[PDB]
Design a protein around this ligand. Structure first.
Ligand SMILES: [Mg+2]
Lengths: 1338, 413, 48, 67, 146
RNA sequence: AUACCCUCGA
C-alpha cells in the first residue's frame, strides 16, 4: 500500500536516478532493419526489450534469467511491460529554464529573484546581460546590461564583475540565493513598510521562501540542466496500415530537442562565433519549452498542418479541457447500449434486455455455469454453444439473469437518479425495454433515446445495486422528498378519466355492496365508468401507531373512483381517492402512501396505478380531433373591437396628438388585455362545454373534451399552450426583445398567415438557440458544483453545537411564498420550541421533524423556529448527521457515509436546463405588528419612521405573521398595534418621491448660511406651485458660494440651542443641492417634520453569479459601522461620510465616488447592516458585516427565487451545503502563530487555537475573519492538489504544488477515484476506517 | 447556405445575432429549416425562390403593383432595395381585376409589419411558399404547426429511408413534383418522342422527326441504374414507368428513382393510424404497429454495404488473391470460387470468407464483420498497370462489352 | 465621426445585405488564385 | 418474499453496514461455510443473504461467532 | 399517442390524418365504382365532382374516355392524392365537405372496436391515413454490446 | 488503432 503522494521539483541527480540511459540519437528506427537504434528514442539499452524475455541478438532466449544482461547483448532480458516504467535522460549542453515556472501568471522564477518576468525574458532570449557576484563594483546583481553597456562596464572594471547571458545566467543566480539570508532580510523588512501593495508582495515573497526552505526544494532545480524522456509506449508510434508509421507529437518534440542539443555540442566544440552559439542556445530553450508546453510564447507548429503540436502539458490536461477523460472517464467493459422502448408489462424493479445484448454481456457467467453444469468441457465448446445459440444455452442464460441486477443510464446523467439498477428480463428484439414510471427520473422519452447498460460483477457490486440503486429504492427525489417515480402523461390521463363524474350516466343511482360488485357491474356493461353511485367499503385506517382499525362505510362516489380504490393499499382512507385524481393529486397520494404504509406496498401501489392507468386510458378511446379545439365565439367580436381601437389610435397618432412612444405602450397594453380576455373566454367556454340531460331539464357539467382533460388532469399540456391552440397567439417578441406592435390573431387550428408564422419563427428560433446554451451552462455549473462540494460527507452523528438558522415562512410580498412547514420538514430543531406563552417546551431538542411534527406545529401557532444547518455543525472534515436533517431520497435520517455534498451539487445543477411603491396596501385582515422599527411618535400621532431598517407586519389571530411589508424612511403610519385592520386598508401613508429628511427635534430653526444665489435660490414654480427656496448647486454657485453650504441650526421656539441625544453637536443637518425645505426658517417645526427632500438578472447566469460570489458592475454600497452618519464632501469628487458611533467613535470612513447616485441622508443612525446606496448587494460586505447566518439566508433566498420562478422545488439543505463548502476558509487578522494575512482553512485555525489554549501562552490564540470564496475558487484552493489539478488550471496548481512541495493524503472522493481506491463515502467507509485503525494506531 | 468554414463564424463565436432570424430573411433564407444542435442558425437553407445577385447577395421575387391594380411584371429585389417599397403579403383581396378591395392589408414598410391602405402599396409577394425552404415546403398544413415542430419535421423528413416500394403521399403540398423532377434521381426524357423498347434495365426512345437533325433520327438510350450503394449505404435503383409505343414529350419522367412514385416524391408510406392510448405501448412518443405493416412489408428497406481488400506490396513479396488460403476449411472454400472471390448471389452469414488474400503464407482474406449478414450483389476488381488480369475481371469485362455491343447493335438496327 | 456625432446610423450585421452568399465557383476561384500566386512566385524566382 | 430492504434498513438505521455484513454472509454462503438460516426458495446468494438479514436470524454478532 | 398533439403545439398531424382519411375513402369509393363496371360517364362525373369542390380548377374533359379516365381511376383506386400547399392549402370546411362526400363522418371520428375485448370505446377516436416515415436510425446499427 | 474535420441523435 501507499499514501500521501508528493510533488516537488526534479533534481538533476534524481533525474539521473529515474533514467535508465542517456538518449543521444534523434532517429528512432532504421528503415532497413526494423529494430530501434542505439541511443535512440526507443533503444533497447535504455527502455527495455521489444519482445518479452528476449534480447537484441537472441543470444539468450530462455525464460530463466529475467534480470541477467548478456555480454554481447547489453540490453537486459526482461518482460516487455518494462518499456512503460523505464525513462531516459538528455544531457543538455547548456541549462534551459522550465516553461511552467516561467510563464505561470505569478512567475516563480521571477518571484524568487525579485526581478520582473520581462527582465528575465530579456536575459533568457540573449538580449541583455545580467550581473553575478557584483563584488566591489558599482554594478548590482539585479542590474541588466546591454551590449554597449556591458562593453563599457568591462572596459571600466576589467574584472570582479561576472556578467552572463541565457538560462546559464539564471541558473547561476538561482543556486546563489541563500534562502536563509533572503528569508531573514525579507522578514525584517516586511513590517517596515506600511504600504498594502508592498506588504502583500513581500508576504508572497515570504510564502515562497518558506515553502522552499521547508519543502526540501532547491531553487536551482527550476532551471533543468537535464530533462527526462517519456517511456516509448506512452509516446508510441502507431504504424498506419500499408507500412506507414504514425509518429506522436511527443516523438516529434523529443526529436527536435535532441537534434538541437546535438547541434549545440558540435558547434561549441569547434568554437563557433558567439552570435550563432547564442542563437543555438535560444533554439534549444525554445525547443524544450515547446516540448513542455505550447502556445504560451512561441506557439510552435507541426509540418504541413496548421494544427499545433500536443505537448506534455496538453497530454496531462487530458481531453475535455482539464476534466481527465482517462482517469475519471475510463471506458469500461461488460457494457452496451441500444434504443430504449416502453415496456408496459414490466414491474418497477425489472427492465427488458435483448437476447443478444444479455448473451454478450454475461458471456463469462454463461461460460462458468456451462462448465459447472458440465454441459461444456473445453471453453471452445462453450463458445461454440453460445455462438450457435443452442436451446439449452437460453436456460443457463435465464439462470444467470434471474437475480443479477444491471445498471441503466442515459447520456447526460444530471443526478444519481440518472443511473439505476434493474433486474433484467430477457426480451425478443434489439431494444432495451424500460418501465414507463422511471422515464421521468431519467428525463428520457422514447423519441430516439439510447441507454447504456452495465453489468456489476462482484457480490459487493450486485448487493449495492440491489440495496442502494435498485429502482424501487429511489422513489423519492434526492432533491426534495416529493416522489419522482410517479404516474406520467398517459397513466395520469387514464386515472383522471376513470375518476370523473357525469351528471347523468348509465348506472347512476344504485348502491353496491362492495368494490367487487362495482367491478362486476362495470365489466358486465351495466354501469358507466363515471356515474354517481353509492358503495360501501372496508377501509383500514392507520390512525394509531401499531393499530390498524378497519371500518365499513357507505360513500357517495362514482364507479371509477370505487374501482381505483380497489388498488389503494390497506392503510389509507377512501377520501384520498374520491377527487378527480389529477397529476398533482396522484403525486401527493403516492407521497402520502410512502410515509404511511411503507416502501414495498408503495412500489406495488405504483405498479398497480400504472397498470390501471394504462388499462383505462386504453378503454377510454380518448383522441385529438380538429373539433376538439373549440374556438370561442366571442373571439371574433373581441378581435374586431381591438382592431377598431388600434385603428382609432393609429389615426390619432397620424393626427400628431399621440406620440409614437406612448402609442406603442398603449397598443401593447390593449392587445395584451384583449389576448387575456380571449383566453379567459376560451377557457370558460371549453371547461364547461358540456350540456347534459338529467331525467328532463338540461344541466351543465365539467367538460369531457379531450384537450380539456389533457390540460386539467395535468397529464400533458398547459393553459399557455391551449392559448395558442384554440385562442389567439398574442404578442410576440422581436429578436431585440421588443414586443411587435401587432399580434398573431390566428391560432393553430385556424392556421397562421405567412407574416405571423415568420414572427413565431423569431420566437421559436430564439428559444431553441437559448436551449443549447442553457444546457451547456447547466453542465458547467453542475460540474463546478460537484467539484467544490465533494469532500463533504456525513461523518459524525451529533457535533454538539446549538447554533443554526432561524427559519420563518417566506412571505416576500403580500402572499406566503413558502409555508413554514415545507421549509423545516425533514430538518432538525436546534433549540427549544415554545408556545405563544413561554416556559412551555413544545419541541424539546434535536428531534427530526417529520410529517407528524409538521402537522403538530401547524396545529399550534409556531411561526419562527431555529433549525440546525450544514452552515453550522462546526465538526472537522465533514458534517454531523443531525445538522444535515432527514435524507430526501429516504424517509429516515441520513446515515454515516452519505456523500451529501455530491447529492447537493447534483440536486442544484440538474434543473439548470429548465432555466434561461408609494404606500402599503394590506392584503387580508390581521392584527398589525411592528418589527425592527425605531421611531418616536409625531405631534399628531403620525409616527414617521426615518430609520432605514424597518418593516410592517400583520400578524394573524393565532399569532403567526401572515404578511410583512418593508416600511421605508419617513413613513407616516396610523399605528394600531393590536387593532385589526380590514383588508385593503392603507395603514402607512408613506409617499417619498424624494429623500425626505426628518426633524426629530422641534423649535424655531435657524437656517444659517442660506444665500439667495450662492447657497439657496428662492425659485418659485408656475401658478405658485411651491412657496419654497431651491438650494443652489455647489458648482452652479459662485466661487465663494461653492464652499458655502446651508445649515439649519437647531434652536428652540425662543432661541435655545438643542442637540440630538448621544452627540454634543446639534442636529443641524445641512441642506444639499436639489432640496425642498418648505418650512420657513424660524418657524416651529414639529418632531419628524420633513426638512430636506432630494429626488432619487435571472436564470442560469444569476445562480452562477450567486455561486461565484461575484461583484456586479455597480455593487450596492453598504454602511460600515453603526453610528451617527455624516455628509459626504462632494467637492473632492468622492463623498466621505464619517461615522461617529455613540458607544465608541471610529473616524475611519471610506470615500464613495459620486459617479453613482447616493441616497444617503446625513444625521441618522448608520446601522452597519443597512444600505447606503441602492444596487444589487455584494455577497461579501454582507458576510463581513451582517455575519454568516445573514449571508446564508440571503444567498438561499436569492437562489430559491430563481428556482421557484420556473417552479422547480429544491430543498435548501443543498444550497446550504454548497454555502458551507464555500465558507470553508477564513482569513486571519492578528495571528500570533501564523502569517499576518493568509487564506487558511477554518479547521486549521480552529485546531491551532485549541492547541494554543492548552499550550505555551494564553494570548497565542488567533483572531480571524470569515471569507467567502466562489465555487471555482474554493475548489481550486483545497489542501489536496490532485483534486484541484483535475478540475481546472492544471498547470498553475501543479506548479504551485511543485514549488510548495505539497503532499496529498488521499482523503477525498476524487483522490480515491483517480488513484483507484474505495470511495471514502458510502460502503467504502468501513474499509477506510479499518485502514485508519491499522495505520494511525501503529 | 452555411456560415462556418474559412472566414466564417465558428460555433464558439455564436452569440445570438447570427442565430436569430430577421425581417431581412423573408423570402431569402428559410426561417424554419435549420439543424437543431450545436450549430443552429449557423447553417440555413435558401428559400424556394431564392436567387443570388450579380454582386453575390440574395434576391427574392416580387410583383410590382400600382395605385389601382396589381401589375403582372415581376422583379427580383435584394435586402437593401426593400426599404423604399412596402411589400404586401401573397394573399389579399382582389376585385377580379387586380384591385385590392380590402381596407387595410398586411404590409411592411421598413421591416415593420403593419396594415396599409392599398393606395400606397408598391410591391406584392409572389407565393406564400417562397418563405420556407424546399424541405419545409413539403409539410402539409405547415400553417397549423409551430416552428419548433416544423423545424423538427423538416430535419426529420431530410433523414428518411427509401422503402421497398415507394408510395406517394395521399396528402402533400404539390411541391413533391418539383423536387422529384429537379433532382437527378429520375430519368427525364431529354428529347420528346415515342418509346421504342422498354425493360427493367434501359429505355429506348424514338426521337420525333420534328425534334431531330437530318441523320440518325431516333437515338436516345436511357440506361437505368440498378441497385447501387449510396453514400448512406442505401439502395439507389430506378424503375421504368413507361410502356412500349406511348408518346412522350420533352421533360417527361421515363423512370423514377429511389423514394419516387411516377414522378412524385415518395419518402415514406401512408397508413391508417389512430390517435388513442393503447395499453401504454405508445407512452411518451412510442409507436405501436400491427403485424400487417411487417407482413405487407411496407417499411422494409434495402441497405447496400461494401467491403474492400488491397494487395499490398509486402516486404517479403506481393500478397496474391488466391483461394488456397492456408489452413482453410472446406465449406468456406466451397462458398468461394477458384479465383478466391465469392460468387455473386450467395447468402453470407457472419464470419464467412468473402475474398481470399494470402500475404507472406499469412491470410489477409476479407470476411464479413460480426453481426453483418447479407447477399452478395456485385464484385469489382481493380488491377495495377502491368499486372495480370485475373479470370473474374475477364468475365466482368466480357459481360460489359457484350452489353455495349448489343446496345449499339439494336441502336443500329 | 459623423456617426459618433449623431449624423447617420451604425450598420448592423442582421441585414442579408451586409452579408453575402458565396458558392462553389467563388471559393474554387479563390483556391485557384492561391495556387496561381504560389506558382507565379516560383516562376518569378526561376524566370529571373 | 422479496429482500426487505425497507424494514431491515430501518432497524439498524444505517443501511450501509447492512450491505457490508450481507456481503460477508453471502460470501460465507457461496463458500459453503454455513447453513442458510432461512430455508432456500430457489434464490441466488445475494437475495437469500438479504432475507436472512431481514428475518433477524443472522446478525453481525451471529456471523462473527460463526466466523 | 394523442397526448403528443397538445403539448408540441402542432395540429398538422390531425388535419393530415383527416385529409388522408378522406383520400383513402375516395380511393375506396373509386375502386368499388371501378369494380362494379361503371361506365366512363359515371367515372368522369365523379372525378369532376371531386375536382370541382373547393380549390384548384377541374382539368377533366380533356382526357379520352377509355384510355386516360380509366388509367386515372386505376391509379386513384389506392387513394385520391390531394395537394395542399404550404400556407394557401385546404381550409377546415373543404376537408369537411370532402369527408361528407366520401360517406365518412364529417367530424373525422367514429367509435372504434377494441381488438381484444371487442367492446366499442365509449368516446369516438380519430382514425385516418397519415404519411409515416422511417428514419435512418435503425436499432440494428445502434445495438452494441461488449 | 492516433489527431483533426464534417454530418447526425438524445
Ligand atoms: Mg427525446
Amino acid at each position: 500500500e501507499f499514501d500521501a503522494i508528493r510533488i516537488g521539483l526534479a533534481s538533476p541527480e534524481m533525474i539521473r536516478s529515474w533514467s535508465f540511459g542517456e538518449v543521444k540519437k534523434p532517429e528512432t528506427i532504421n528503415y532497413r532493419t526494423f529494430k530501434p537504434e542505439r541511443d535512440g528514442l526507443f533503444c533497447a539499452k535504455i527502455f527495455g526489450p521489444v519482445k518479452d524475455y528476449e534480447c537484441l541478438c537472441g543470444k539468450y532466449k530462455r525464460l530463466k534469467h529475467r534480470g541477467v544482461i548478456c555480454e554481447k547483448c547489453g540490453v537486459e532480458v526482461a518482460l516487455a511491460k518494462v518499456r512503460r516504467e523505464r525513462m531516459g535522460h538528455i544531457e543538455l549542453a547548456s541549462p534551459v529554464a522550465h516553461i511552467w515556472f516561467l510563464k505561470s501568471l505569478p512567475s516563480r522564477i521571477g518571484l524568487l529573484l525579485d526581478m520582473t518576468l520581462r527582465d528575465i525574458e530579456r536575459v533568457l532570449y540573449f538580449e541583455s546581460y545580467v550581473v553575478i557576484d557584483p563584488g566591489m563594483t558599482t554594478l548590482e546583481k539585479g542590474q541588466l546590461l546591454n551590449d554597449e553597456q556591458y562593453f563599457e562596464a568591462l572596459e571600466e572594471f576589467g574584472d570582479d564583475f561576472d556578467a552572463r547571458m541565457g538560462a546559464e545566467a539564471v541558473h547561476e543566480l538561482l543556486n546563489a540565493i541563500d534562502l536563509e539570508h533572503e528569508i531573514g532580510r525579507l522578514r525584517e523588512e516586511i513590517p517596515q513598510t506600511n504600504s498594502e501593495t508592498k506588504i502583500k508582495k513581500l508576504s508572497k515573497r515570504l510564502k515562497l521562501m518558506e515553502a522552499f526552505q521547508g519543502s526540501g526544494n532547491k531553487p536551482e532545480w527550476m532551471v533543468l540542466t537535464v530533462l527526462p524522456v517519456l517511456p516509448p509506449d506512452l509516446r508510441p508510434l502507431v504504424p498506419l496500415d500499408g507500412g506507414r508509421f504514425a509518429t506522436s507529437d511527443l516523438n516529434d518534440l523529443y526529436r527536435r530537442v535532441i537534434n538541437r542539443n546535438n547541434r549545440l555540442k558540435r558547434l561549441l566544440d569547434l568554437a563557433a562565433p558567439d552570435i550563432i552559439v547564442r542563437n543555438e542556445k535560444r533554439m534549444l530553450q525554445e525547443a524544450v519549452d515547446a516540448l513542455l508546453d505550447n502556445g504560451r510564447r512561441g506557439r510552435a507548429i507541426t509540418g504541413s498542418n496548421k494544427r499545433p503540436l500536443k505537448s506534455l502539458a496538453d497530454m496531462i490536461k487530458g481531453k475535455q479541457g482539464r476534466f481527465r477523460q482517462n482517469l475519471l472517464g475510463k471506458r469500461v467493459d461488460y457494457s452496451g447500449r441500444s434504443v430504449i422502448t416502453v415496456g408496459p408489462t414490466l414491474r418497477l424493479h425489472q427492465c427488458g434486455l435483448p437476447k443478444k445484448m444479455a448473451l454478450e454481456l454475461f458471456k463469462p457467467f454463461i461460460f462458468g455455469k456451462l462448465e459447472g453444469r458440465g454441459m461444456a468441457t473445453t471453453i471452445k465448446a462453450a463458445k461454440k454453444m453460445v455462438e450457435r445459440e443452442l436451446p439449452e444455452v437460453w436456460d443457463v442464460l435465464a439462470e444467470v439473469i434471474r437475480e443479477h441486477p444491471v445498471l441503466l443510464n442515459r447520456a447526460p446523467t444530471l443526478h444519481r437518479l440518472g443511473i439505476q439498477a434493474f433486474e433484467p428480463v430477457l426480451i425478443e428484439g434489439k431494444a432495451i425495454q424500460l418501465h414507463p414510471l422511471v422515464c421521468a427520473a431519467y428525463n428520457a422519452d422514447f423519441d430516439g433515446d439510447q441507454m447504456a447498460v452495465h453489468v456489476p460483477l462482484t457480490l459487493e457490486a450486485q448487493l449495492e445495486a440491489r440495496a442502494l440503486m435498485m429502482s424501487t429504492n429511489n422513489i423519492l427525489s434526492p432533491a426534495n422528498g416529493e416522489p419522482i417515480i410517479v404516474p406520467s402523461q398517459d397513466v395520469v390521463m387514464g386515472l383522471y378519466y376513470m375518476t370523473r363524474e357525469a351528471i347523468n350516466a348509465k348506472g347512476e343511482g344504485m348502491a353496491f355492496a362492495d368494490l367487487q360488485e362495482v367491478d362486476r357491474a362495470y365489466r358486465s356493461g351495466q354501469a358507466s365508468l363515471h356515474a354517481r353511485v353509492k358503495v360501501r367499503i372496508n377501509e383500514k385506517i392507520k390512525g394509531e401507531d401499531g393499530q390498524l382499525t378497519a371500518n365499513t362505510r357507505i360513500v357517495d362516489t362514482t364507479v371509477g373512483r370505487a374501482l381505483l380504490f380497489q388498488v389503494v393499499p390497506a392503510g389509507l382512507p377512501f377520501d384520498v381517492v374520491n377527487q378527480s385524481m389529477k397529476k398533482k393529486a396522484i403525486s401527493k397520494l403516492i407521497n402520502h402512501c410512502y410515509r404511511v404504509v411503507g416502501l414495498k406496498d408503495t412500489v406495488i401501489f405504483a405498479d398497480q396505478l400504472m397498470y390501471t392507468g394504462f388499462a383505462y386510458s386504453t378503454i377510454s378511446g380518448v383522441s385529438i380531433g380538429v373539433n376538439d379545439f373549440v374556438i370561442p365565439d366571442e373571439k371574433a367580436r373581441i378581435i374586431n373591437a381591438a382592431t377598431d381601437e388600434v385603428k382609432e389610435i393609429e389615426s390619432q397618432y397620424a393626427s400628431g396628438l399621440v406620440t409614437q412612444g406612448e402609442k406603442y405602450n398603449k397598443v401593447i397594453d390593449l392587445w395584451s388585455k384583449a389576448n387575456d380576455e380571449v383566453s379567459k373566454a376560451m377557457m370558460a367556454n371549453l371547461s364547461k362545454e358540456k350540456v347534459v340531460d338529467r331525467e328532463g331539464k338540461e344541466v351543465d357539467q365539467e367538460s369531457f373534451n379531450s384537450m380539456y382533460m389533457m390540460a386539467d388532469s395535468g397529464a400533458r399540456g398547459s393553459a399557455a399552450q391551449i392559448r395558442q391552440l384554440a385562442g389567439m397567439r398574442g404578442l410576440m417578441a422581436k429578436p431585440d426583445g421588443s414586443i411587435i406592435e401587432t399580434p398573431i390573431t390566428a391560432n393553430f387550428r385556424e392556421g397562421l398567415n405567412v407574416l405571423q408564422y415568420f414572427i413565431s419563427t423569431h420566437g421559436a428560433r430564439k428559444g431553441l438557440a437559448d436551449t443549447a446554451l442553457k444546457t451547456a451552462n447547466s453542465g458547467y455549473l453542475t460540474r463546478r458544483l460537484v467539484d467544490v462540494a465533494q469532500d463533504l460527507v456525513v461523518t459524525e452523528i451529533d457535533c454538539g453545537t446549538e447554533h443554526g438558522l432561524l427559519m420563518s415562512p417566506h412571505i416576500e410580498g403580500g402572499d406566503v411564498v413558502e409555508p413554514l412547514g415545507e421549509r423545516v420538514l425533514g430538518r432538525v430543531i436546534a433549540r427549544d420550541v415554545f408556545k405563544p406563552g413561554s416556559d412551555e417546551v413544545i419541541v424539546p431538542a434535536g428531534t427530526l421533524i417529520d410529517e407528524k411534527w409538521v402537522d403538530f406545529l401547524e396545529v399550534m401557532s409556531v411561526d419562527e423556529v431555529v433549525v440546525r444547518s450544514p452552515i453550522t455543525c462546526e465538526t472537522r472534515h465533514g458534517i454531523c448527521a443531525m445538522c444535515y436533517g432527514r435524507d430526501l431520497a429516504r424517509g429516515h435520517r441520513v446515515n454515516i457515509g452519505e456523500a451529501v455534498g455530491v447529492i447537493a451539487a447534483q440536486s442544484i445543477g440538474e434543473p439548470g436546463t429548465q432555466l434561461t411603491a408609494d404606500n402599503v396596501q394590506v392584503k387580508n385582515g390581521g392584527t398589525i405588528r411592528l418589527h425592527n422599527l425605531k421611531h418616536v411618535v409625531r405631534a399628531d400621532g403620525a409616527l414617521v419612521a426615518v430609520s432605514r431598517s424597518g418593516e410592517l407586519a400583520v400578524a394573524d389571530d393565532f399569532g403567526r405573521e401572515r404578511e410583512r411589508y418593508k416600511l421605508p424612511y419617513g413613513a407616516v403610519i396610523s399605528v394600531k398595534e393590536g387593532d385589526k385592520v380590514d383588508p385593503g386598508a392603507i395603514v402607512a401613508k408613506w409617499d417619498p418621491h424624494t429623500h425626505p429628511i426628518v426633524t426629530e427635534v422641534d423649535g424655531t430653526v435657524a437656517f444659517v448660511g442660506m444665500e439667495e444665489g450662492i447657497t439657496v435660490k428662492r425659485q418659485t414654480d408656475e401658478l405658485t406651485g411651491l412657496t419654497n427656496i431651491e438650494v443652489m448647486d455647489p458648482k452652479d454657485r459662485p466661487a465663494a458660494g461653492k464652499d458655502i453650504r446651508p445649515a439649519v441650526k437647531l434652536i428652540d421656539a425662543a432661541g435655545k440651542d438643542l442637540l440630538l441625544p448621544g452627540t454634543d453637536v446639534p442636529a443641524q443637518y445641512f441642506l444639499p443641492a436639489n432640496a425642498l425645505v418648505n418650512l420657513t426658517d424660524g418657524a416651529k417645526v414639529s418632531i419628524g417634520d420633513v426638512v430636506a427632500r432630494i429626488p432619487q438578472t435571472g436564470g442560469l447566469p444569476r445562480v452562477a453569479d450567486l455561486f461565484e460570489a461575484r461583484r456586479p458592475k455597480e455593487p450596492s454600497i453598504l454602511a460600515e459601522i453603526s453610528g451617527t452618519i455624516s455628509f459626504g464632501k462632494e467637492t473632492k469628487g468622492k463623498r466621505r461620510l464619517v461615522i461617529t458611533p455613540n458607544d465608541g467613535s471610529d473616524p475611519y470612513e471610506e470615500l464613495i465616488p459620486k459617479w453613482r447616485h447616493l441616497n444617503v441622508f446625513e444625521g441618522e443612525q448608520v446601522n452597519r447592516g443597512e444600505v447606503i446606496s441602492d444596487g444589487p448587494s455584494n455577497p461579501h460586505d454582507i458576510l463581513r458585516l451582517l455575519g454568516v447566518s445573514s449571508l446564508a439566508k440571503y444567498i438561499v433566498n436569492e437562489i430559491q427565487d430563481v428556482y421557484r420562478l420556473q417552479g422547480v422545488k429544491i430543498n435548501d439543505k443543498h444550497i446550504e451545503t454548497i454555502l458551507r463548502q464555500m465558507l470553508r476558509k477564513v482569513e486571519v487578522s492578528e495571528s500570533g502563530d501564523s502569517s499576518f494575512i493568509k487564506g487558511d482553512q477554518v479547521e486549521l485555525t480552529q485546531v491551532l487555537e485549541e492547541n494554543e489554549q492548552l499550550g505555551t501562552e494564553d494570548k497565542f490564540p488567533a483572531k480571524y475573519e470569515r471569507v467567502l470564496l466562489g465555487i471555482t475558487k474554493a475548489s481550486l484552493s483545497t489542501e489536496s492538489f490532485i483534486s484541484a489539478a483535475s478540475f481546472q488550471e492544471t498547470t498553475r496548481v501543479l506548479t504551485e504544488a511543485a514549488v510548495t512541495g505539497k503532499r496529498d493524503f488521499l482523503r477525498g472522493l476524487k483522490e480515491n477515484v483517480v488513484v483507484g481506491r474505495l470511495i471514502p463515502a458510502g460502503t467504502g467507509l468501513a474499509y477506510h476506517s479499518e485502514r485508519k485503525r491499522q495505520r494511525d494506531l501503529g | 447556405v452555411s456560415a462556418l468554414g474559412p472566414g466564417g463564424l465558428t460555433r464558439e463565436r455564436a452569440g445570438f445575432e447570427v442565430r436569430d432570424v430577421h425581417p431581412t430573411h423573408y423570402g431569402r433564407v428559410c426561417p424554419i429549416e435549420t439543424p437543431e444542435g450545436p450549430n443552429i442558425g449557423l447553417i440555413n437553407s435558401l428559400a424556394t425562390y431564392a436567387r443570388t445577385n450579380k454582386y453575390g447577395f440574395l434576391e427574392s421575387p416580387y410583383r410590382v403593383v400600382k395605385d389601382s391594380l396589381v401589375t403582372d411584371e415581376i422583379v427580383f429585389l435584394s435586402a437593401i432595395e426593400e426599404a423604399d417599397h412596402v411589400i404586401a403579403q401573397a394573399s389579399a383581396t382582389l376585385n377580379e381585376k387586380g384591385q385590392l378591395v380590402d381596407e387595410l392589408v398586411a404590409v411592411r414598410h421598413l421591416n415593420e409589419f403593419t396594415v396599409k391602405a392599398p393606395e400606397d402599396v408598391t410591391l406584392m409577394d409572389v407565393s406564400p411558399k417562397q418563405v420556407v425552404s424546399v424541405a419545409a415546403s413539403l409539410i402539409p398544413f405547415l400553417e397549423h404547426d409551430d416552428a419548433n415542430r416544423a423545424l423538427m419535421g423538416s430535419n426529420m423528413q431530410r433523414q428518411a429511408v427509401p422503402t421497398l416500394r415507394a408510395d406517394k403521399p395521399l396528402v402533400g403540398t404539390g411541391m413533391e413534383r418539383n423536387v422529384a423532377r429537379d433532382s437527378g434521381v429520375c430519368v427525364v426524357a431529354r428529347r420528346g418522342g415515342v418509346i421504342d423498347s422498354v425493360d427493367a434495365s434501359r429505355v429506348v426512345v424514338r426521337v420525333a422527326d420534328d425534334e431531330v437533325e437530318t441523320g440518325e433520327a431516333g437515338v436516345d438510350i436511357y440506361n437505368l441504374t440498378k441497385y447501387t450503394r449510396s453514400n448512406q449505404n442505401t439502395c439507389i435503383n430506378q424503375r421504368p414507368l413507361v410502356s412500349k409505343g406511348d408518346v412522350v414529350a420533352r421533360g417527361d419522367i421515363l423512370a423514377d428513382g429511389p423514394s419516387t412514385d411516377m414522378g412524385e416524391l415518395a419518402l415514406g408510406q401512408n397508413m391508417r393510424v389512430a390517435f388513442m392510448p393503447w395499453n401504454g405501448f405508445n407512452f411518451e412518443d412510442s409507436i405501436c404497429l400491427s403485424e400487417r405493416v411487417v407482413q405487407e412489408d411496407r417499411f422494409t428497406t434495402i441497405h447496400i454495404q461494401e467491403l474492400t481488400c488491397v494487395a499490398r506490396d509486402t516486404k517479403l513479396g506481393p500478397e496474391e488473391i488466391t483461394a488456397d488460403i492456408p489452413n482453410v476449411g472446406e465449406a468456406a472454400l466451397n462458398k468461394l470460387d477458384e479465383a478466391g472471390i465469392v460468387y455473386v448471389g450467395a447468402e453470407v452469414q457472419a464470419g464467412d470468407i468473402l475474398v481470399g488474400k494470402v500475404t507472406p503464407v499469412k491470410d489477409t482474406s476479407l470476411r464479413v464483420p460480426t453481426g453483418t449478414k447479407g447477399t452478395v450483389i456485385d464484385v469489382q476488381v481493380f488491377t495495377r498497370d502491368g499486372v495480370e488480369r485475373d479470370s473474374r475481371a475477364l468475365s466482368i469485362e466480357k459481360m460489359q462489352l457484350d452489353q455495349i455491343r448489343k446496345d449499339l447493335n439494336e441502336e443500329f438496327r | 465621426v459623423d456617426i459618433r456625432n449623431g449624423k447617420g446610423i451604425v450598420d448592423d450585421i442582421d441585414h442579408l445585405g451586409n452579408r453575402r452568399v458565396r458558392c462553389v465557383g467563388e471559393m474554387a476561384e479563390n483556391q485557384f488564385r492561391v495556387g496561381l500566386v504560389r506558382v507565379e512566385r516560383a516562376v518569378k524566382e526561376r524566370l529571373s | 418474499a422479496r429482500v426487505t430492504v425497507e424494514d431491515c434498513l430501518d432497524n439498524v438505521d444505517n443501511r450501509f453496514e447492512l450491505v457490508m455484513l450481507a456481503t460477508k454472509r453471502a460470501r460465507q454462503l457461496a463458500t459453503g461455510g454455513k447453513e442458510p438460516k432461512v430455508a432456500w426458495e430457489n434464490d441466488k446468494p445475494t437475495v437469500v443473504a438479504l432475507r436472512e438479514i431481514a428475518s433477524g436470524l443472522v446478525d453481525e454478532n451471529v456471523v462473527q461467532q460463526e466466523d | 399517442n394523442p397526448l403528443g398533439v397538445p403539448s408540441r403545439m402542432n395540429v398538422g398531424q390531425i388535419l393530415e390524418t383527416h385529409l388522408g382519411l378522406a383520400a383513402k375513402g375516395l380511393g375506396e369509393k373509386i375502386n368499388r365504382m371501378l369494380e362494379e363496371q361503371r361506365k366512363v360517364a359515371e367515372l368522369r362525373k365523379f372525378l369532376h365532382e371531386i375536382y370541382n369542390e373547393i380549390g384548384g380548377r377541374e382539368e377533366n374533359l380533356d382526357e379520352l374516355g377509355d384510355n386516360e379516365i380509366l388509367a386515372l381511376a386505376k391509379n386513384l383506386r389506392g387513394g385520391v392524392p390531394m395537394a395542399t400547399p404550404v400556407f394557401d392549402g385546404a381550409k377546415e370546411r373543404e376537408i369537411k365537405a370532402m369527408l361528407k362526400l366520401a360517406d365518412l363522418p364529417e367530424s373525422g371520428q367514429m367509435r372504434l372496436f377494441d381488438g381484444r375485448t371487442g367492446n366499442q370505446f365509449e368516446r369516438p377516436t380519430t382514425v385516418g391515413y397519415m404519411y409515416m416515415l422511417k428514419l435512418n436510425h435503425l436499432v440494428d446499427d445502434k445495438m452494441h454490446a461488449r
